[PDB]
Design a protein around this ligand. Structure first.
Ligand SMILES: CC(C)(C)C(=O)N[C@@H](C(=O)NO)c1ccc(Br)cc1
Ligand SMILES: [Mg+2]
Ligand SMILES: [Mg+2]
Ligand SMILES: [Zn+2]
Length: 889
């Protein structure tokens, strides 16, 4: 296993100036001819010419139109093409090759592959080497001239980067298209698409240069009517980057293409973005509400890459977070502006503090700029993406909007058309930091620790108030637990957005303030504070940290009701919940350990329940926010606070807490579920695919959340509401009716009903699969078997496999069955999947990420299955490295 190190970076001894491709798609094979106009770089030391080339069938290779003989002049081991230096020229030369590949049987979905009836490429990060020989690394910038030929019947639409400069007929019912893309680009941004595609189109005129940009969105003919929202999101994305960042699109045309088989969400190939179908296609009749936020973010994400990723690219893959973390940040700013709901920001924080915090306290923990990798695909992580985004967002919090836009502009102008590192961005921000602080002595050298230091910082507080002097103090410290990456952790630059709430009237006591914590501990003092305040800390979640507010539940309730910041309210609620959960957990645990005949449980705080009722009944309060407060924290958030987690005890704990709150508020829940119906399920714009109301969708989220609570509680005659719910035109509703019916005898009745509604739409069926997979059923294992035999079968579609299994993995009581059969089931799916798709195989390993946080029995069970997987003779490099790191080997 070759290990690559960040410290070992050095420029290539070679240069690739021009790439001339001929791609020749036939029924049984695809022939790829490539001419590389190359040169010798100043870093050259007469070394062998080594190309990346994975799974290529060599017909012939040449240097300056002279054939190379195998063995005497070169060797090829199906991974590297090694041309001995004595046969390598010392000036400008041309390398050429003709190889054969087979997209039809490429089920790894990397390189060139077939998705249903569409030929499509995926080259990031190391996919281009699976198409032809190349020095497959992002710092090898080249010009591209690409010709694609194919059967005209089967592949009328041909697409690649750049401008289409020629179209021509070919004898035998074939045709060709030539694409010239003069601007330099890394090879992972190369793309090609061939198929019977249908499209929607529009013309966008840029804000400043008034340039006409042709926008095209593609899909297979059957789903062409699901492209409308995507086109709207693209227009929105272009407008936002113009309005916020002052950035216009520089090309004549932008294509978006949806394919059914895709490993991730989408890919930002220059002028040819390629999407997972579930992240581009939607209709109000055939999609759940989440699809609309999903498509908005993903279309937005790929578009913002055009500057942060494409025009300013990476020096090496260790700088991945520079384009991904920064683009997610831009996507988040975009989404918050478009949705105009507080739940947008809350949803990102909810994701980070559950999934990413878990990762960062697991053996897989890494900094957003990793120090090493075996398979780069294994580091496209929530750490690199989402913690990266938070690190990028903190710049904005520190600098403020005005100076952040100035610093960002410096970064773009100074690095446009070039490769860049994380240091380059921090430099640009430091320039704005100097301007803001009004002295050239200020620097952001400490901030670089955010890129290099792994683990989640812990921030705790102590408060003091002197009523006589009207003086308030906030004593703060930070701490990061040592791990396998850093022996000693250093204090980070932590920006703490704070407010001070007057507990008597709920008003703000000070103006907007961001405390800059740069030491291990500090004391921030405030004068002229009339009364003892309740601190509103880390407003907007201003830093990716564990917050320990040290507030009483009384104080947290007051913030929940009266604070102005959405997150702090949300977090105060979260902290009240966590305290309750941890208390009841230990009480349940001690009773189990000591085998007690009787014991007591601490009831849920009555004033807390009163506060929930208060908010729920407030008509001016946000429906989305309401759905969060009636929901306990994510299991993966909770586990970060519990050692040797007994999943049954946690399940017991949650059930007790929900029942306590339900026994008081169920009537309020039902009353709200009925009153929200009119606005939530309004059909006025059901046939307008460009009209999306995120507030209305939040109301539906609240209704479906309340319905779930009422169903679990077996509320009187709630089954009637469930039946009526199944007749709703909105998929979010009638799929909800399926999952909540799990607690009734009518489940399999709705199972068949919803299946018939879903079966004729590829994406809708996959949502149905997720709904079934996540169903709280005692017979879920029998149900999964039914899905495998009747629906899933032999499908190699990642959307299909992930839909069937991943939701089930979050079933706290059933997946973590003490027999370990849940662990055995997924390990079998992982090993099975690994034979044709290593990336998705590692994706299916997500349940095992918390293995060492569980009780000793469940630890042993998970560990056994992972060791079983590790001993599979044909295990991929991706899966092997992932499991080796996860199990600390
Ligand atoms: C769902 C989400 C994580 C946002 C995604 O699609 N990421 C892309 C990406 O960054 N597109 O620009 C992605 C692309 C390549 C690889 Br390998 C992994 C993830
Ligand atoms: Mg091959
Ligand atoms: Mg299919
Ligand atoms: Zn991206």
């Amino acid at each position: 296993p070759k290990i690559h190190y960040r410290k070992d970076y050095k420029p290539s001894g070679f240069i690739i100036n021009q790439v001339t491709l001929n791609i020749n798609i036939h029924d049984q094979e695809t022939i790829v001819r490539s001419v590389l106009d190359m040169d010798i770089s100043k870093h050259n030391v007469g070394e062998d010419l080594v190309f990346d080339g994975v799974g290529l069938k060599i017909n012939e290779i040449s240097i300056n139109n002279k054939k190379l003989v195998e063995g005497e002049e070169y060797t090829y081991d199906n991974e590297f093409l090694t041309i001995f230096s004595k046969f390598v020229p010392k000036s400008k030369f041309a390398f050429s090759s003709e190889v054969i590949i087979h997209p039809e049987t490429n089920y790894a979905l990397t390189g060139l592959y077939k998705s249903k009836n569409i030929i499509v490429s995926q080259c990031e990060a190391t996919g281009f080497r699976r198409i032809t020989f190349f020095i497959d690394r992002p710092d090898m910038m080249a010009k591209y001239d690409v010709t694609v030929t194919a059967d005209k019947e089967k592949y009328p639409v041909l697409l690649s980067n750049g401008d289409k400069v020629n179209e021509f007929e070919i004898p035998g019912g074939r045709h060709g298209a030539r694409f010239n893309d003069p601007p330099l680009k890394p090879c992972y941004l190369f793309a090609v698409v061939a198929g019977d595609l249908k499209h929607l189109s529009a013309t966008y005129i840029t804000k400043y240069t008034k340039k006409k940009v042709e926008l095209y969105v593609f899909s297979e003919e059957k789903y062409v009517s699901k492209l409308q929202w995507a086109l709207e999101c693209l227009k929105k994305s272009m407008a936002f980057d113009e309005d916020y960042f002052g950035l216009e699109y520089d090309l004549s045309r932008l294509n978006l293409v949806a394919v059914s088989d895709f490993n991730v969400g989408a890919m930002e190939n220059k002028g040819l973005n390629i999407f997972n179908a579930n992240s581009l296609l939607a209709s109000k009749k055939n999609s759940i509400d989440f699809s609309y936020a999903r498509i908005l973010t993903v279309v937005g994400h790929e578009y913002f890459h055009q500057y942060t990723g494409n025009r300013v690219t990476l020096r090496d893959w260790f700088q991945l977070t520079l384009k991904e973390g920064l683009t997610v940040h831009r996507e988040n700013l975009f989404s918050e502006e478009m949705t105009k709901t507080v739940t947008t920001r809350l949803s990102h924080v909810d994701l980070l503090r559950s999934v990413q915090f878990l990762e960062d306290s697991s053996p897989l923990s890494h900094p957003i700029r990793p120090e090493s990798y075996v398979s780069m695909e294994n580091f496209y992580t929530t750490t690199v993406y989402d913690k990266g985004s938070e690190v990028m967002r903190m710049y904005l919090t520190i600098l403020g909007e005005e100076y952040y836009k100035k610093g960002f502009d410096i970064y773009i102008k100074k690095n446009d058309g070039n490769t860049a590192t994380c240091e380059d961005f921090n430099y640009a921000m430091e320039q704005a930091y100097k301007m803001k602080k009004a002295d050239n002595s200020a620097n952001l050298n400490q901030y670089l620790l955010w890129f290099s230091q792994s683990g989640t910082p812990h921030v705790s507080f102590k408060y003091n108030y002197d009523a006589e002097k009207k003086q308030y103090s906030i004593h703060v410290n930070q701490y990061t637990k040592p791990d396998e990456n850093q022996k000693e952790k250093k204090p980070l630059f932590i920006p703490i957005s704070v407010g001070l709430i007057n507990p008597e009237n709920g008003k703000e006591m000070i103006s907007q303030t961001t405390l800059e914590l740069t030491k291990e501990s500090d004391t921030f003092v405030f004068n002229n504070i009339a009364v003892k305040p309740i601190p509103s800390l880390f407003r907007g979640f201003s830093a990716p940290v564990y917050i320990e507010d040290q507030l009483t539940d009384e104080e947290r309730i007051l913030l929940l009701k009266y604070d102005s910041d959405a997150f702090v309210r949300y977090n105060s609620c979260t902290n009240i919940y966590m305290k309750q959960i941890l208390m009841n957990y230990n009480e349940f645990l001690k009773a189990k350990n000591e085998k007690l005949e009787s014991f007591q449980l601490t009831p849920v705080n009555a004033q807390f329940i009163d506060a929930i009722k208060y908010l729920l009944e407030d008509p001016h309060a946000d429906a989305g926010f309401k759905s969060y407060i009636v929901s306990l924290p994510q299991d993966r958030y909770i586990i970060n606070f519990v050692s040797n987690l007994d999943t049954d005890v946690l399940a017991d704990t949650k059930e007790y807490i929900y029942k306590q709150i339900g026994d008081k508020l169920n009537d309020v829940y039902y009353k709200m579920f009925k009153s929200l119906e009119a606005k939530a399920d309004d059909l006025t714009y059901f046939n307008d695919e460009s009209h999306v109301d995120f507030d209305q969708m939040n109301m539906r989220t609240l209704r479906n959340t309340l319905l779930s609570l009422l169903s679990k509680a077996q509320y009187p005659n709630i089954l009637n509401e469930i039946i009526e719910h199944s007749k709703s035109p909105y998929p979010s509703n009638w799929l909800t009716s399926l999952s909540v019916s799990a607690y009734f005898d009518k489940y399999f009745e709705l199972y068949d009903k919803t299946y018939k509604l879903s079966k004729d739409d590829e994406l809708l069926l996959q949502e149905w699969l997720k709904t079934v997979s996540r169903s709280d059923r005692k017979d879920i294992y029998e149900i999964l078997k039914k899905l495998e035999n009747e629906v899933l079968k032999d499908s190699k579609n990642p959307n299909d496999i992930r839909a069937v299994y991943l939701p089930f993995t979050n079933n706290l009581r059933r997946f973590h069955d003490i027999s370990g059969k849940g662990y055995k089931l997924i390990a079998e799916v992982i090993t099975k999947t690994d034979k044709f798709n290593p990336m998705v195989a590692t994706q299916l390993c997500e349940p095992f990420k918390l293995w060492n946080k569980l009780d000793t029995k469940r630890q042993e069970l998970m560990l056994n299955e992972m060791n079983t997987m590790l001993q599979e003779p044909q295990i991929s490099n991706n899966l092997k490295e992932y499991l080796l790191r996860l199990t600390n080997k």
